[PDB]
Amino acid sequence: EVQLVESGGGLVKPGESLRLSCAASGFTFSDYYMTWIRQAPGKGLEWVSYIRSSGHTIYYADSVKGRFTISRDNAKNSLYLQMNSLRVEDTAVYYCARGGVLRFLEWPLNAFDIWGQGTMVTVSSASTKGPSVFPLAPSSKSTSGGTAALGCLVKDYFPEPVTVSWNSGALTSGVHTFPAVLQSSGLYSLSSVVTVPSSSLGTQTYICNVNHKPSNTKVDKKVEPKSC
Amino acid sequence: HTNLCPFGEVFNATRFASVYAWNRKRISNCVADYSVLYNSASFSTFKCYGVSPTKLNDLCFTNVYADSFVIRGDEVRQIAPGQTGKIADYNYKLPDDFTGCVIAWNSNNLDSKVGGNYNYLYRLFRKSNLKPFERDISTEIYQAGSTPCNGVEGFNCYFPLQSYGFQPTNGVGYQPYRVVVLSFELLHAPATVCGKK
Amino acid sequence: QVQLVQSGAEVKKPGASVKVSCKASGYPFTSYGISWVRQAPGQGLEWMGWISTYNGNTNYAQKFQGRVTMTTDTSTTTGYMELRRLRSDDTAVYYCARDYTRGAWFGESLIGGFDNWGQGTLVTVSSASTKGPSVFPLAPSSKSTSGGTAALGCLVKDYFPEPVTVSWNSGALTSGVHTFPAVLQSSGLYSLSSVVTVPSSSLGTQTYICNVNHKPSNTKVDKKVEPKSC
Amino acid sequence: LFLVADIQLTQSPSSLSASVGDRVTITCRASQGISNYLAWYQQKPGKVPKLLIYAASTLQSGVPSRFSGSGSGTDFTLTISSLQPEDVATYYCQKYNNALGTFGQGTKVEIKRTVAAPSVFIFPPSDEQLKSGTASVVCLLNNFYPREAKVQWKVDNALQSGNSQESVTEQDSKDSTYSLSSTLTLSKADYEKHKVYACEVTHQGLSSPVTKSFNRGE
Amino acid sequence: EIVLTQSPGTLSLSPGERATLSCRASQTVSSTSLAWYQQKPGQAPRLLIYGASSRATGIPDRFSGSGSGTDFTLTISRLEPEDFAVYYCQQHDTSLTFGGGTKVEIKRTVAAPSVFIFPPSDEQLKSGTASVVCLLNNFYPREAKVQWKVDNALQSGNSQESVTEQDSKDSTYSLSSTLTLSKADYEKHKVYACEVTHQGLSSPVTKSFNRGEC
Ligand SMILES: *[C@@H]1O[C@H](CO[C@@H]2O[C@@H](C)[C@@H](O)[C@@H](O)[C@@H]2O)[C@@H](O[C@@H]2O[C@H](CO)[C@@H](O[C@@H]3O[C@H](CO[C@H]4O[C@H](CO)[C@@H](O)[C@H](O)[C@@H]4O)[C@@H](O)[C@H](O[C@H]4O[C@H](CO)[C@@H](O)[C@H](O)[C@@H]4O)[C@@H]3O)[C@H](O)[C@H]2NC(C)=O)[C@H](O)[C@H]1NC(C)=O
Ligand SMILES: N[C@@H](CCC(=O)O)C(=O)O
Ligand SMILES: [Cl-]
Ligand SMILES: [Cl-]
Ligand SMILES: [Cl-]
Ligand SMILES: [Cl-]
Ligand SMILES: [Cl-]
C-alpha cells in the first residue's frame, strides 16, 4: 500500500527542539524527492523544505532557514525534519509529501500525489492537561415524532487536538464535532453532538470516544437519558 | 636517501575518490620500485604513454604524481590522451602529449553495495570541457535553459553530479574500476625520484 | 625473512613507566608503520596505537591517550612504546607488529592488517617483590578410587613473579601429567599445582619427585611425594 | 544559495459562494512562467489536502470528471463544471517548476442554498461536572442556513452577556447547512442561585424567536 | 566506536569438519578494512585474512572470508589439528578495534571427570596456612562446577580454580580448585569435601576427607 506515515508531533517549549519522522511504504522511496509542508491554525498551506532523491540538494523556506534540518535515510525508508530553536509561530500541522522521480533531462510532472496524514506541533510555554468529558444528556421532553440530540462536552484540555468518535466509529451519520474554543483559562473546550431518533433512546446505547494523545488520555463516556 | 616510494598506499588504499574529485598524491625523494607494478597480475589495464615500463626502472624524474579515482568499465577507455566522453570532457582529462601510465582494475568486490553504492559520483553537466589535469569539484546548479536558476534545482536547472549505480549484479561495463594515473615530470630541477641501482 | 624481536619481560611497581623496544629486519623500515597490541592474561587483543616510521605521526587508542608515547629510530630499524603511570590493571603481554592498515607516508587507511608480529613482552605491574615458591606435596589418598588410578602432585605456592617450571622425575615422567596455569592470589603472589595420574599399584614400587624451578629467585626445589603418615 | 527578490502565486477570488450546479472558476496567477508545473488541491476543513489536478490539466485518478484544469506559463484556472454539495472546501494551487513547491493563498468555496431553520436543543450541566464546582450549559443549533444566527442566554429572564462562547461548524458536505454550539459557563454556586435556564435563538428561517428552556431539578 | 562481537564463543568440531565463524559490527563497515587473525596457545597472533576476503601470504587454501555491511564470516573448509585455536575479528574503518575472539575446540565424546581431593600437607600446616585441593581430571566438555563444603557448609570466596588447555592426545580438560583457609580456621572443622557437577555425571560426585583420617 503506497502511503506515508508521520510521527513525532507534540508539545514543545519555545527554543527547544523536536524531530519529525515520515515512513514510506509501497514505493521506491529513494527514487523520489521529499518535501515538508506545514499549515498553521486557520492559515494556508506553506512549503517548508525539500530534499533531493539522495540528499545532495536541500532547500528551506526563509521562515525556517538555519533552524530546521531535513534529512532522509533511504535504507530505513524514512524522511526526517529536525526542528531546532522552535518558535510559537512554528505551531502547525506538518505534512510530508513525495515529489516526483528525477530522471535524465526531465523535471517530473507526476509529483505531490501522496502525502502523510499530518502531525501536530505546538510550541508554547503552557503545560499539558487532559480533558474532562461530561455528557450532554438527551432531552427528557424530546418528541413523539423523533429526532433528539445528545452529545459530549470535552472541557479544559491543552494542547490541541482531541479526537472524538461515537460508538467506536459505528455512529457517524448526523454527528457534529465542533471546532475547539480557547477559554480564558488558556484551556480548550470542545463539544460533539449527534441527532438520533427519539424511539432509539430506550433501545440504543450511545458512547462518545474522546482521545487526547498529548496527555495520554482516552475516555469513553456513556451518554444516556437522565434518571426520570 | 633510501626510502621506497609509497606506491603501496596509493594502490592498496581502502577508499578512492570520485572521478570528479580525483585525488592527487605527490611522490618525491624516494627510490621508485616499478617492478611491483608491471609484475603484479592484479591489473586489468596497464598502458604507458611517452615511456616504456621496462625502461622505467633506469630513469630519473623530478616528481611523480599519482592520481587515483573510480569510474565504470566502459569509461576506462577514456583515461588516455585524445579521448572524448563524459569523463574525459567533464571529469579527468589527460593531455595530448601525456607521458605516463594508466593502471586500472575491477573493484566490484569493494565498491558495490547490495542496494547500490551511491558514494561514487561523476560530473554530468559542464559549460566547457576540462583542460588537461584540471579538477572541478563545484556543485553549482547547471543552467540548461534561458531562464536563470538562482542556484535552485528544477526544470532546466540540473544538479551537475551523477551517482554511479554500482551493484554487484551489474554488467562488467557498469561495475566499478579503480584507476591510478602515474604522470612523470622532468623539470629543470634536481631529480628526486629515480629507480634502483 | 621479516622478523620482529622485542625487549625482555619487565616487572614494574604501580606508578612506574616501562619502555618496550621492537627491532625489525628483512623489509624496508620506512615503508611500513608499527602498531602495538596488548593482551591481558586470559583476555583478548587490545589495540594501543600506531606510529609512522616515515614522519613519526601517531594516533593512540583513547584509553591510553595521555599515558602512552610511541617513537621510532630509523637508524636502528627499532620502534619504541612507552606506557607511563603503570597500574596493576596494565599487566599484560605487549605485542609489536608490522602495520598495513595506515600508510606511513600519507596516513590514510590501507587494505591490510598486522603481519609479522613480535614474540611479545610480558610486563608485570605489582608491588610484590621477588619471592621463591614453597612446594608442598599433594599426597596420594589411601582412600581408593574405583578405576584403580591414583592421583598425586605438588602445590607450588606463593611465588613472584612468573614463571615457574615443574617437571616430574627429572623429566622421565610426562604421561598423565597436568601442570595447571598459575593463579594470582589476593596476596599478590602466584600459586600453581601440578598433578599426575598413575596406576595405584605403582605407589608401592615407584618414587615420584617433582622438580620445581623458579629462575627469578634462583630457586630450585625437588620434593618427594609419598602417601600420608600417621 | 537561495535568496531572490522567487515566483509568487496569486489566487483569485479569495472567497466565493455559489449554488449547486453552477460553474465555478478559480484563477491562479504566477509572477513568472512555470510552464505547466502547477497542481490544484482540495482541502476540507481539518483534513489532508487532496490532489485534484497536476501538470496544469491532468486529472488525478479518482477525482470526479467535473473538475478540470487549464493553463500554461502564468495563467491557470481550476474549473468545477457543475458545483456539488460535497465540493465545499478551500482550494489551493501549488507550483512545482523547481524545488520550491510554493502554494497560493487558497480559495474558499461556499455553497448558497435555500434557507433552513435550526433545530434548537438545550443541555443542562452534567451531575459529574457539578461535583467539580463549575456548570456548563449548552445550546445546540442544528442544521441551519445561512450562517448568520444569534443566541441569547437568559437566566431567570435575565439576559446574559460575557459568560458564553460559541463555535460554528463548516458547511456540511451533504446538505450544505451549518451548526452552532454555545456554552454558557457559571460557577456551581451561581448555577444553584437560579431556576429557569433558556437560550433564545433568532434566525432568518424562524418567523419568531425559538426558546428552549429547562428548570434546575427536572 | 565500532564494536565487533564474534559468535559463537566456542566452536566444538572434529577434524575434517567445516568451521564457520562470524563477527557482527555495531555499525556498517567497509569490507576493505576487515581482518581475521589466529592465535595458537602461547604464540603471537598471525594474520589470516585482510580486506574481508583476501588471503594473507602463506595461509593455506582452507581459510576464506566473506561478508559485508555488518555481518562478516570466516570459514575453514576442512578442519585440521593445527587449526584449533582462537580467532580474532578486526576492523579499522573508524579507529581500530578487535573482536571478542572465537575459540575452535576439538569435539569428542562426553567424559565424566575423575575427582580427587588432597588435604593440606603437614609441611604447609606448620606455616599457618591450609590449602585443600580438588582435582577434576580428563573430562569433556569444559563446563564443570566445583562446590566446596566444609561440614556441609557451602564455601564461597575462599577458592580459586584453573583449567588446562585441551590435551593434545585425548582432547580432554582438567581443572584444579584450591580452597584456602588459615590453620586456625582449618582446625575448626571436620569434614572437607568438594562436589563436582558435570554433564558426564548422572548425579553430582562428592569426594571428601576427615581432618582425623590416616
Ligand atoms: C598491495 O598488497 C598486496 C598484498 O600485500 C600483502 O598483504 C598485506 C596485508 C601486507 O602484509 C603486505 O606486506 C603483503 O605483501 C601486494 O601483493 C604482494 O606483492 C608482493 C610483491 O611486492 C608479493 O611478495 C612475494 O611473494 C612471494 C610468494 O608469492 C608466490 O606464491 C603465491 C601462492 O599463491 C602466488 O599467489 C604469488 O603470485 C607468488 O607466485 C614470496 O616468496 C616473496 O618473498 C620472497 O622474496 C622477498 C624479496 O623479494 C624476500 O624478502 C622474502 O623474505 C622472500 O624470500 C615476495 O614476498 C606478495 O606475494 C603479494 N601478496 C599477495 C597477497 O598478492 C601488492 O604488491 C601491494 N601493492 C603495492 C602497490 O604495493
Ligand atoms: N543551496 C543550499 C541551501 C539553500 C537554501 O538556503 O535553502 C543547499 O542546497 O545545500
Ligand atoms: Cl541526491
Ligand atoms: Cl522559483
Ligand atoms: Cl508556500
Ligand atoms: Cl511564498
Ligand atoms: Cl594437559
Numbering used by the authors:
A (entry chain A): 1 to 228
B (entry chain E): 332 to 528
C (entry chain H): 1 to 230
D (entry chain B): -11 to -7, 1 to 213
E (entry chain L): 1 to 214
Would you copy out the relevant sentences from the publication that reported this structure?
S from both SARS-CoV-2 and SARS-CoV-1 uses angiotensin-converting enzyme 2 (ACE2) as the cell surface receptor (Hoffmann et al., 2020, Li, 2015), ACE2 is expressed in a number of tissues, including epithelial cells of the upper and lower respiratory tracts. S consists of two subunits, S1 that mediates receptor binding and S2 responsible for viral and host cell membrane fusion (Walls et al., 2020; Wrapp et al., 2020). The S1 fragment, at the membrane distal tip of S, includes an N-terminal domain (NTD) and receptor binding domain (RBD). Although both regions are immunogenic, the RBD contains the interacting surface for ACE2 binding (Lan et al., 2020).
Antibody 384 is our most potently neutralizing mAb with an IC50 of 2 ng/mL. Its binding mode is unlike any other SARS-CoV-2 antibody reported to date. It approaches the binding site on the top of the neck and left shoulder from the front with a relatively small footprint of 630 Å2 (460 Å2 contributed by the heavy chain and 170 Å2 by the light chain). Although the orientation of 384 is similar to a group of previously reported Fabs (CV07-270, p2b-2f6, and bd629) (Kreye et al., 2020; Ju et al., 2020; Du et al., 2020), it is shifted 20 Å toward the left shoulder such that it does not contact the right chest. Only CDRs H2 and H3 of the Fab 384 HC interact with the antigen. It is unusual in that the 18-residue long H3 of Fab 384 binds across the top of the neck to reach the H3 binding site of the important IGVH3-53 group of Fabs (discussed below), making hydrophobic interactions from F104 and L105 at the tip to L455 and F456 of the RBD. However, the main interactions that contribute to the binding affinity and orientation are with RBD residues 482–486 on top of the shoulder. W107 of H3 makes strong π-interactions with G485 and Y59 of H2, contacts V483, and makes bifurcated H-bonds to the carbonyl oxygen of G482 and amino nitrogen of E484. The latter also forms a salt-bridge with R52 and H-bonds to the side chains of T57 and Y59. CV07-270 is swung forward and sideways (compared to 384) so that it does not compete with ACE2 binding, suggesting that the potency of 384 derives from the extended H3 interaction that reaches across the ACE2 binding site.
